[PDB]
Design a protein around this ligand. Structure first.
Ligand SMILES: CN(C)Cc1cc(CNc2cc(Cl)cc(C(=O)NC(C)(C)CO)c2)ccc1O
Lengths: 39, 156
């Protein structure tokens, strides 16, 4: 039996940690909502 | 119970201790999360109950108490922020330039940040603070790195 707990406001924070790359990936989406890497 | 706008944890007592199975967004009195977080189950908020209203397994989305309300879209250019809510850790804005999922039905923005499954449903924000989608449906590639679609629903 699941319950929710408030974690924060939804705001853009000026000077947040900046990280991660931006890959362009070929993918498929199946009926079950599963994404798969084509290449 | 709590109907305030904001980002929430979704918790269960069905596993060891209190476990975080994911995250979602309360906006205009509707709760927004990923289908694979709740599998469409009812949610407690205080002695408040939230009942499912809309959902689709293929989109991996679900709304509670009302129709899907989040309608903003990635512009395809600008940096975004993942408002990560990791299990047992404070909400933390992470800023990134999305990549792309190329699909036979068109292209979707993708966020390449490595958080554990319980972060599923954390919101992705534009610079006006609007939610452009939820993080937690995607692919694991190469070394075990995660890339999530920017998953957005449709407002009527
Ligand atoms: C239609 N289904 C496919 C939806 C679906 C989604 C999940 C969640 N998947 C997930 C989410 C996140 Cl935010 C992270 C990770 C992960 O593996 N991260 C690391 C860093 C690689 C290791 O911790 C996985 C689960 C079962 C499901 O059916």
């Amino acid at each position: 039996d699941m319950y929710i707990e408030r974690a924060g406001d939804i705001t853009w924070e000026k000077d947040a940690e900046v990280t991660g790359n931006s890959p362009r990936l070929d993918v498929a989406l199946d009926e079950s909502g599963d994404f798969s890497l084509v290449e | 119970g709590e109907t305030t706008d904001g980002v929430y944890r979704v918790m269960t007592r069905r596993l060891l201790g209190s476990t975080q199975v994911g995250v979602g967004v309360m906006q205009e009195g509707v709760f927004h999360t990923m289908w694979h977080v709740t599998k469409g189950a009812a949610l407690r908020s205080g002695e408040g109950r939230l009942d499912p209203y809309w959902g689709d397994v293929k989109q991996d989305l679900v709304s509670y108490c009302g129709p899907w309300k989040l309608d903003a879209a990635w512009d395809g250019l600008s940096e975004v922020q993942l408002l990560a809510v990791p299990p047992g850790e404070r909400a933390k804005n992470i800023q990134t330039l999305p990549g792309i999922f190329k699909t036979k039905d068109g292209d979707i923005g993708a966020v390449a940040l490595d958080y554990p499954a319980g972060t599923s449903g954390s919101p992705i924000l534009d610079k006006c603070g609007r939610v452009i989608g939820l993080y937690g449906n995607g692919v694991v590639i190469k070394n075990g790195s995660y890339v999530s679609a920017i998953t957005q629903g449709k407002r009527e």
